[PDB]
Symmetry: C2
Subunit: 827 residues, 2 copies
Amino acid sequence: LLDNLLSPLQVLDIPMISWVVMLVSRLLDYVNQWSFINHERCISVVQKLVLFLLSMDFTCHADLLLFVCKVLARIANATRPTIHLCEIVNEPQLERLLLLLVGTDFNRGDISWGGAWAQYSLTCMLQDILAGELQLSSVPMLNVCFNKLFSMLQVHHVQLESLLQLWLTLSLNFLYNANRIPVISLNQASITSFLTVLAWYPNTLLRTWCLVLHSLTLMTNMQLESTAHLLVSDPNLIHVLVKFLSGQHSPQVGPTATQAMQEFLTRLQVHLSSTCPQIFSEFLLKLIHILSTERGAFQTGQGPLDAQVKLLEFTLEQNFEVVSVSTISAVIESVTFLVHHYITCSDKVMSRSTRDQLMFDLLKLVNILVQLPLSGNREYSARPAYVADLVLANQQIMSQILSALGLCNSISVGDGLFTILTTLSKKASTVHMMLQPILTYMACGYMGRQGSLATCQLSEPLLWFILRVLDTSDALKAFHDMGGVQLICNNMVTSTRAIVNTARSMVSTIMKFLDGIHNFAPLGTITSSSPTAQPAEVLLQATPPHRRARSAAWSYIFLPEEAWCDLTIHLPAAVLLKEIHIQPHLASLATCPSSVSVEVSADGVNMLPLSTPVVTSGLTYIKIQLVKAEVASAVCLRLHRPRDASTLGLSQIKLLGLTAFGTTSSDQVSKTSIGWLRLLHHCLTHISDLEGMMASAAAPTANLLQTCAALLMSPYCGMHSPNIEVVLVKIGLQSTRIGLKLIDILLRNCAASLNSPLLFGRLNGLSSDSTIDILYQLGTTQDPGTKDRIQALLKWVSDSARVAAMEYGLLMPSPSHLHCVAAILWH
Amino acid sequence: LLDNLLSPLQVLDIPMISWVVMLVSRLLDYVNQWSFINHERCISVVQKLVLFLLSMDFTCHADLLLFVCKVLARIANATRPTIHLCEIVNEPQLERLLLLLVGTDFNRGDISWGGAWAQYSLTCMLQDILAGELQLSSVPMLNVCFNKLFSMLQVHHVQLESLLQLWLTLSLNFLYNANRIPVISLNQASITSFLTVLAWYPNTLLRTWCLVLHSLTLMTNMQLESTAHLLVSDPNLIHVLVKFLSGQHSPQVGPTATQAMQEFLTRLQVHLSSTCPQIFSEFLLKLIHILSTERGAFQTGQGPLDAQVKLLEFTLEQNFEVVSVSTISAVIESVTFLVHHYITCSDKVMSRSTRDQLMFDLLKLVNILVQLPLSGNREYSARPAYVADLVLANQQIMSQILSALGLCNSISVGDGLFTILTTLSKKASTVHMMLQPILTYMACGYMGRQGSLATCQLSEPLLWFILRVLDTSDALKAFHDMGGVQLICNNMVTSTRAIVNTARSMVSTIMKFLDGIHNFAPLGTITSSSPTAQPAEVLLQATPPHRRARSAAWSYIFLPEEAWCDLTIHLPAAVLLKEIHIQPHLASLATCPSSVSVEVSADGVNMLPLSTPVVTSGLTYIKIQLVKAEVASAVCLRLHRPRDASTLGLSQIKLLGLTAFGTTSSDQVSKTSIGWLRLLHHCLTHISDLEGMMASAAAPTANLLQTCAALLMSPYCGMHSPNIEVVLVKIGLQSTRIGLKLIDILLRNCAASLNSPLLFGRLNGLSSDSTIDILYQLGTTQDPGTKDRIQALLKWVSDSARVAAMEYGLLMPSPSHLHCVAAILWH
């Protein structure tokens, strides 16, 4: 009946056909993909049903199409030798059929031919018929058709997303699995056109990308040169993966997309492993280089951080043997520049309640790369020189790394840099290779500047690294041979001139005599630029409201056109602001500001934003820490209207910091000259057998003893007094002349002998346990100068006596130093 | 006393000096900027105090420095002829003093010389001394010094941020104001080096930018060629403003930075207005072009949207006379490409609870630009041709605009495009200039493709535009002369072949006989991949929990390493999912997911992410609307851990959509061929005097009447039946032959005479009010064909009679058509 009703296709009574198709559908379904709807004569009727599907125009209706598809599938699958797709259609028919699903003459993006239900029904019918099959195989014909469909992407005759979805659906035979061999084999031209289109494809949304990654994965599993090789060897693959990784939605792509990318890369690695894994590792390194280069995704903070971190994690497990040194060095250089920028461009505030992980993973990758042995000709990682040597010889890379570590303080990004530098030192061909960049760094100031008072930036981490490099006698001897001792001694003198001591002295003491951070908000006065706003004085109260206070202490009603509310807190006097706490109304977190822009005014008149607004939606407590404490007599909080409320509710605002003086006034290597002294102490003491040499290198430098004494008589600035004492004794004893100079510095004139050192800050002849010990050791140490030393000591005694019988050192001899001279004579 | 104590500067007893300085400070303060601390001999002591400040090294202490600064300022300001800075210091001294504040040998980024309090005290002292001044003026000397300091930026001897802060502070005399003339005049070399450094400066945080903008503003107010001209004429200014505008923090810069940018641009405009405003307008257009070009900020969705919108708003108020046509056309082209990308790359979901404003403002700018008169030589906007003409002649721009409007549906971005097109038509030199791009667009398919069934995308907005362009007789005549009637008629036939009707027909009726969107969540089964998660079935309940329910209906405890929780809802059958509602626990909005990644599965096995995760922190209700309804038998919600909680709390999840059939199964121009018919009706009816011509152009096209009849007998698809009837009568009457064909189509064979039209879908001879009216009018209209028409009518009667005495049209004559023939004979 249905056969005869359709016979005109090969006048139609569409109403009678409809009744019959519905009846036949109901009978066949009484005989899961079709729940949404709730053997030669068989070939005849199914062929006619396909013709009918192909004949449907605007006079036909999608709802009938659904049943036609359902019945077609069910009949194909009901016959003993299942009817194959190649018995049902021919090539032009199959092509038109698939174009109903994917052609741009039938589908206009959001508008699909026959609607979503028709698309779905057609797909389900094709899938059912194929599955029944999986005499003549239909796969050859599907291959022809899909290769044509892929050849049609470049001219915009086929929609990428629908083609991919369809090819995935039909080739999976139904759950996706990254190890599946597609039923429908695409040819090399298809894969190439696919990559080309993707490289230029402008509208790649996330669903499209997930389809793309799943399909690339399955393509790698096709027997086409393997497809994995074709793909990785194609320049377009890098463009495509860069587009993907370069990106109110979250920047992320979410776990499923990230895992899709991982599965793709894993499949590439696996297919290339037992043949040519070097091109895969080189592809990964080229990719990372592109992402890390200036104005690239990593540098601009673009793209799905989750996918980028996953890429780095995957890359860190790869074997980089037989990789070109050019790509390795390119990635090392881009990465070191990137991480240096990252550490130097750090935001001025921090709010918490990650890109660090990405930077750390890149530094880990660099660590892996610098350890690779080089080939004989130094062009490829091998498998006794190393990539490390090329890096050490690169002055710009080493400068960037060392200054980066110089900007770190006491595993993180700084730890990553330390690990790299430690590796570089272990892998350096010679200790000189490692020392030369260190010495270059120590010989210049900020960003390689020169100048009289310009000296390089030290940090506890960088210092620890240098000490590790200077750990062996061979390293210390080389350091000496390259003029390192003179360099650190000069740097100590210079840096001591170019810093003022921030440790409190007697001015702070006189202030205290005249009467962990502290909340100054309660002392403040709070205003709003809005004339209608509720008085916010309650926000300043030292004691917050109860964590269940049902009504926000303070509320702001936004006019429908208002994006920002402002609250300015004027303090009675400037303070060193370190943190700003904002407590939103916990009971109604929808009224929390979506973001907060902090401006600070030192003079309390000219406000300056601290940073870009911090995102605060979803936070129960907003803690904005100033990385660098700022002098502030006023703080303007600009609170952005909540995402999902017209009122802003706040409980408390705290402005935490320190006063200059009073009770509320509560990395030395980075802020003082002490790091140079710690280096000098290490050189003088670490390898006793070299002390002599080091002392002789150090003793000549002008004003070194005066500076070291100054550091000795300073409040603790990151070096325990005994080490400074040891430095002073070893230099003072390395020769008689310097011994006399040290005695004169301690007892008589301790000042330096606009860029010249001065050391005016200390009274002459002051004594401490340290100077007593030093003088005792100078007196009682037995060597050629001992006599002269005693002599000078006795001179200072009689001189003092003489002045007393009538130089602040001589008008005010320390009783302790006199007693020390007596204790020396006694011994 | 203090003078004599300091006399060694020009041995120091720093303790005695400290006591004295503190006493003197207390006496002077008993005789607001210094609250943070709580006349030739005068020149002598102040000079010595400056020497002391300059002599401070690590043996001196910052706390004393504070009082030294306070006392220095107070003494300078206490003497009758205030002591001027130039009496206190000389050039090298002043330079060192300022370098204490801004030099990189004394300041290391976060580490400042003497600490924040010392920096502040030094600044306050300089400001106080200057203010007292404002015999010899100190301004010349400050000019020298600051020009030197700016010359020192390029070699990294001066920190940009501190130099800018200091120059701003000192030149303002204290509240900042964009109309202030700086006290300290910088020279051309300074401004040039400033711009150069800024162009390359890698670490420009927001405070740096605010300083930069304030200082550029004030520089424009300096009498240096005016400084405004120097700035705008400098290529670096564009690089700098692009860096600024190209950018958990909000992408925005906040109101203060945005206003700083506006003030800067306003000052540039004002300074350049009465001299050379064309270079300023050209600068604005070059800037916008750079931001809008491919891979630029606007295109990549980067930078402070608030500042970018403010830039566009500012630009929209400028006069663009005497601007080069090259820059105008460049910006028009980049902007049209951008907005086309924007409309075509729209996200697949939408969540609400803006970049549109930016796109709309760019389209407004384009609208302003296309209206500019051209100079005689067509190289510069003038002040009777227009930029509009150049745009109309640009095929790529017109294609992009028209396809963009083709993707819009019934002021927004689409309104902006419509406004532009309307302007282009009003400004076109001739109607042909406007019609040619329309006709080109109508002659091709998607992205200019060709093909048998490929036809262009129409939309209600684009259609309205075309009708407005075809409003006059001159326009309709030209449209006819260029073959537009034949084009729209062919397009109607073709598009009708290439679409299936999605309107419900009798299959939906039979389904209903066999028994605004709907929540299918309650029918679903919900699971989590986490074995420990609480059963989430409560989330599916049709009825939400009370809006004050104190305990989340469902909660998920995140393991410390878990970023995502997942909830998969399997539905009993596929549905057309249109929306996903997620109700978080309103009482505890801290437990709301920070973001939600929706995956949908049509087969309920293979999940595909819909889009990148939607940001949901701060939302009281999460409504994710699928722009394109998707078939879904399962939905996987991946909820991201809250920003500030280890538990996720949810009240309800709804999955709203439609079933294919049943009770729950509840822009035609874009999805049908009707737009072509609305155009044909407009051509045939709008200017009665042209009807003849139009009809003669339309009547020849093959299968046109069959298609128009098909559309007539279709369910309403965006065209009321009377208009279709008018089209049919006018064509059928334009000649006797076609009249006979129309009679045969209505009474006998209505089917078309894989790309050929078919129109199989309709029984022959069916009647409606419309066909009755058409046939009546054909019969009773008096003209040459009338007789033949009656004749054919009578033929159909007797033929029918004859078949009855023994073509479905003849075996089933409509009683209504027979009666209509009788009513015709009677008249």
